[PDB]
């Protein structure tokens with residue numbers, strides 16, 4: 032079956048996932064909520080509306096007491112209203128990014144890298160590890176991310192179905208969920224994406240590339256030992272292609288975030304560091320979180 | 326894994342091409358036809374042509390329901406053709422997957438369009454059989470195609486007479502890995518001697534490379550000397566597959582003659598009534 036070194040690798044990543052992924056979102060508190068009650072620059076606004084409306088969600092908050100608060104966003108009719116969920120979205124993103132930083136911090140193979148390379152791997156993979164973790168709480172039947180007492184529900188349109196799948200970020204979630212991956216497979220995907228030698232500012236290419244290869248081999252070997260079903264043929268290569276697709280979604284998402292941020296600033300200071308909104312000097316929060324213990 | 330990095334990348338490209346284009350669970354095979362619920366020498370040969378490849382059909386609904394179809398026992402008549410429209414839809418679905426497979430390969434993509442057509446015309450049936458072998462259950466004599474199953478008619482060991490059936494039992498017995506099946510598909514796809522091929526030298530060179538990669542994969546990844554002649558056994562299976570292919574084309578053409586059933590894509594692949602002009606659907610599918 033799997034080697035002892037492989038069984039230890041899976042155990043360590045799994046232990047790190049459980050210690051740093053709060054799946055019930057119990058500690059997600061003090062977040063902002065939406066309120067109770069030219070030429071050429073108009074083309075920027077045209078793209079920003081396309082960027083936002085495709086990612087449109089309604090928010091549900093179930094109280095411990097049994098009560099339910101529901102927020103339905105406004106339909107697109109002008110400016111300012113389209114940005115109502117952004118402060119909340121930035122807060123959820125920030126809480127998720129902090130969990131991802133903690134995940135990387137507990138892993139010995141990441142801990143033993145120079146601080147600058149820790150910053151560069153985190154900068155390069157944060158969104159990717161966030162999407163992987165969010166996929167585990169995605170309900171593909173209801174088009175809803177189920178975050179404990181918080182729920183994010185995809186806004187139903189006249190297009191589909193077919194219209195929602197036109198958004199690569201949404202299609203990724205349905206395509207990844209269809210694979211019915213195990214916790215071990217998701218965690219090995221996070222490890223693969225985290226240890227990418229080709230991220231900007233990475234100096235220790237060889238060490239990172241060698242760590243990535245062993246996570247990839249461990250994944251292939253895990254699949255071979257646990258997936259004999261004819262449903263799971265080529266599962267390893269499907270996962271690898273999904274990771275390649277996630278890297279592409281990531282590049283598109285960064286450019287999309289900058290466009291929204293350019294006309295409507297919303298990004299938190301941690302988000303501005305990870306996304307490059309204006310190495311140890313330009314990433315103060317990251318450096319501090321990395322110096323702190325877990 | 327004692328292969329060249331090139332050889333390792335050649336396998337990776339074929340494996341990638343296979344995962345992208347082989348719907349192993351047949352989940353996208355939908356909207357197919359089903360048998361309804363309701364000169365003399367030509368008809369004599371056609372009866373012999375169909376009777377041997379007789380199958381029952383099983384369809385398992387997601388709800389748990391089972392629909393089963395048993396074919397008629399000759400007697401007439403046009404009833405011997407009851408499963409052809411379904412079969413034409415299944416082959417057409419398989420053929421589209423084979424075209425997509427070939428399209429993702431750099432070695433194939435880099436060849437002139439006319440040669441892409443000629444290779445696809447020559448190898449389509451062969452690559453389909455190779456993929457069907459992977460879903461073949463030699464114990465139950467059934468091709469397990471997701472929610473569909475094609476079960477061989479127990480008439481009445483006598484199946485071994487039909488070369489198309491003997492092929493599936495013999496190939497299955499070799500217990501090949503995915504990598505070996507995909508290298509088999511490449512060897513068959515890149516056949517230089519196919520009718521209408523121009524670049525014989527280039528195609529021959531590519532085939533030899535795939536064969537050497539297959540040979541090397543076997544030496545390095547299989548317990549030697551138990552698998553001493555596995556490469557040669559695979560090469561004999563391919564030779565037998567080529568003769569099965571020539572026979573199957575003649576068989577399909579005889580059936581078509583007296584009972585037209587082939588879809589437009591099948592008509593182009595098999596030569597049923599300027600290489601781009603005589604293969605319009607294929608050209609479109611390769612240009613997409």
Ligand SMILES: O=S(=O)(c1ccc(F)cc1)C1(c2ccc(C(O)(C(F)(F)F)C(F)(F)F)cc2)CCCC1
Nearest residue numbers: 378409411412413415416454457468475489576577
């Ligand atoms: O390849 S199979 O395992 C296959 C399986 C399901 C399936 F639906 C189409 C193909 C199988 C077979 C191959 C070709 C043909 C036909 O080509 C022929 F009748 F014209 F010869 C056609 F498809 F036209 F009917 C019929 C049956 C079935 C049994 C022998 C091999």
